[PDB]
Curated annotation (Swiss-Prot):
This is Peptidyl-prolyl cis-trans isomerase FKBP4. Homodimer. Interacts with GLMN; rapamycin and FK506 abolish the interaction with GLMN in a dose dependent manner. Associates with HSP90AA1 and HSP70 in steroid hormone receptor complexes. Also interacts with peroxisomal phytanoyl-CoA alpha-hydroxylase (PHYH). Interacts with NR3C1 and dynein. Interacts with HSF1 in the HSP90 complex. Associates with tubulin. Interacts with MAPT/TAU. Interacts (via TPR domain) with S100A1, S100A2 and S100A6; the interaction is Ca(2+) dependent. Interaction with S100A1 and S100A2 (but not with S100A6) leads to inhibition of FKBP4-HSP90 interaction. Residues 29-117 form the PPIase FKBP-type domain. The lineage of its organism: Eukaryota, Metazoa, Chordata, Craniata, Vertebrata. Phosphorylation by CK2 results in loss of HSP90 binding activity. Immunophilin protein with PPIase and co-chaperone activities. Component of steroid receptors heterocomplexes through interaction with heat-shock protein 90 (HSP90). May play a role in the intracellular trafficking of heterooligomeric forms of steroid hormone receptors between cytoplasm and nuclear compartments. The isomerase activity controls neuronal growth cones via regulation of TRPC1 channel opening. Also acts as a regulator of microtubule dynamics by inhibiting MAPT/TAU ability to promote microtubule assembly. May have a protective role against oxidative stress in mitochondria. The C-terminal region (AA 375-458) is required to prevent tubulin polymerization. It is found in: Cytoplasm, Cytosol; Mitochondrion; Nucleus; Cytoplasm, Cytoskeleton. It comes from the Eukaryota.
Amino acid sequence: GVDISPKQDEGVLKVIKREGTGTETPMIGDRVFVHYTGWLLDGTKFDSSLDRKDKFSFDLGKGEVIKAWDIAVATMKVGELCRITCKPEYAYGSAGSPPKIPPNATLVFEVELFEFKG
């Protein structure tokens, strides 16, 4: 249930809901297989991979997602889940997401992690 923003200024609060089950947390440059739901700060759901049919998957600091996902995935264990509460510095704040988001709108992502490296 960690935080790195109203202290050092790294844009995020990651809530533990479903802890851990396998063997450890991932490393910088790791291949990871996730499942996400996500909302804007007004309570508006822009995406939900669970409803669309397929899953989400990335490589920690390689192609790249958002900095709030690289911070929260680095601190997450094999198989379980967490809800991300992040500032625009770690997400769309520099330019905005093309169909609906501008340079100053806070975010919310509930992300599950199944497997990564060991």
